[PDB]
Design a protein around this nucleic acid. Structure first.
Ligand SMILES: Nc1ccn([C@H]2C[C@H](O)[C@@H](COP(=O)(O)OP(=O)(O)OP(=O)(O)O)O2)c(=O)n1
Ligand SMILES: *CC[C@H](OP(*)(=O)O)[C@H](O)COP(=O)(O)O
Ligand SMILES: [Mg+2]
Ligand SMILES: [Mg+2]
Ligand SMILES: [Mg+2]
Ligand SMILES: [Mg+2]
Ligand SMILES: [Mg+2]
Length: 326
DNA sequence: GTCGG
DNA sequence: GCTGATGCGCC
DNA sequence: CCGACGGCGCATCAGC
């Protein structure tokens, strides 16, 4: 936690701009600045030193000088002591409650956990499950438990059809000692960029995981993306494991490398890499890397035979999953 | 809030 | 129905 | 100073 105080301050400012101000670009500006300062291998002495880093301008430099002087930020001190700002920030921690829904609830007098539980009728399905597991979803997953969850998913997927390949991505594939949730990239030979030779390919895997009581709830479900809740089985007399968030993304098998690049992240690494691609006249999504024409229209997919191939196109040296974190 | 053109 | 916009989610 | 800021899946709603 070398520049922990500064990165915490910038994260708190980011969350305010997203949750209260609904200023997504100011949120992205603060997260970018937080990320670059976290990687900086010196104790920052002044704002002028911070200002030399990319993504740190005049206003963040001024907030760092204030922070290093006083140990706090008057702007945050005031945000913390404002009821409406504080209420919106709390409600946004419930899965399914974003900035819009949070501000709506605060206007209806719903500002606390007790207010939410008294007014379940006013919540959509996602928001009901977010409230139900509010405590559990706050908790991080030790790598040891992620390895157990991996064993269940991969073995259960193999039982449905041995042609499925399931890859656990997110912070796990970046080699983190704990993860916020479980992200599963799924492929099957019968789903490519060219044809859907089999229907219900994702449905069948979700059903199997429900059948053995691993998946416990569904937040949303379509043909390619599942968003739900799972839980490790516990032994006799021992306390239940917390309920965990699970994302399952079915990716065309021929577009695996763009898919696994997307799903490995981190989110800030993806934004930086995709931003850099545009500067080099390319657009990257989870399916393809495409060149941009003179117009700014995306051309045809370029050939990708590895993660590294995508880095080569945008003239970046390969970063291993472990060097893509914040 | 930042920054390259 | 459908489409397009918006909210909230994922990395 | 200015335009751009990553890209998209699913749920929900307004308008036809
Ligand atoms: N969900 C997945 C995972 C992998 N693959 C394919 C892509 C590659 O052709 C091969 C394995 O690639 P990986 O990047 O997963 O390689 P590993 O690091 O697991 O193993 P190795 O280094 O031996 O290739 O399987 C796939 O179609 N679907
Ligand atoms: C950090 C100071 C702010 O920078 P931004 O362009 O969000 C403004 O300079 C003043 O703060 P605000 O008036 O409270 O937004
Ligand atoms: Mg700078
Ligand atoms: Mg939230
Ligand atoms: Mg995340
Ligand atoms: Mg995750
Ligand atoms: Mg996730």
């Amino acid at each position: 936690t070398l520049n922990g105080g500064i990165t915490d301050m910038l994260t708190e400012l980011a969350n305010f701009e997203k949750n209260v101000s609904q200023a997504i670009h100011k949120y992205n500006a603060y997260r970018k600045a937080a990320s670059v300062i976290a990687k900086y291998p010196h104790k920052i002495k002044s704002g002028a030193e911070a200002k030399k880093l990319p993504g740190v301008g005049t206003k963040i430099a001024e907030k760092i000088d204030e922070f290093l002087a006083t140990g706090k930020l008057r702007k945050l001190e005031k945000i913390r002591q404002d009821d409406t700002s504080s209420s919106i920030n709390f409600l946004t921690r419930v899965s399914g409650i974003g900035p819009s829904a949070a501000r709506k609830f605060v206007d209806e007098g719903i500002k606390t956990l007790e207010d939410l539980r008294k007014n379940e009728d006013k919540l959509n399905h996602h928001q009901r499950i977010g409230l139900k597991y509010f405590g559990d979803f706050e908790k991080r997953i030790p790598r040891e438990e992620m390895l157990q969850m991996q064993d269940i998913v991969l073995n259960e997927v193999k039982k449905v059809d041995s042609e499925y390949i399931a890859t656990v991505c997110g912070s796990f594939r970046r080699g983190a000692e704990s993860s916020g949730d479980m992200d599963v990239l799924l492929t099957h030979p019968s789903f490519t960029s060219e044809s859907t030779k089999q229907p219900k390919l994702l449905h069948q895997v979700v059903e199997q995981l429900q059948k053995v009581h691993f998946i416990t709830d569904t937040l949303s479900k379509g043909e390619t993306k599942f968003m739900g809740v799972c839980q490790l089985p516990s032994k006799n007399d021992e306390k239940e494991y917390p309920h965990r968030r699970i994302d399952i993304r079915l990716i065309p098998k021929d577009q695996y490398y763009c898919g696994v690049l997307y799903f490995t992240g981190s989110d800030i690494f993806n934004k930086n890499m995709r931003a850099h691609a545009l500067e080099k006249g390319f657009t990257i999504n989870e399916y393809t890397i495409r060149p941009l024409g003179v117009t700014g229209v995306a051309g045809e997919p370029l050939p990708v035979d590895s993660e590294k191939d995508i880095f080569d196109y945008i003239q970046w040296k390969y970063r291993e999953p472990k060097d893509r974190s914040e």
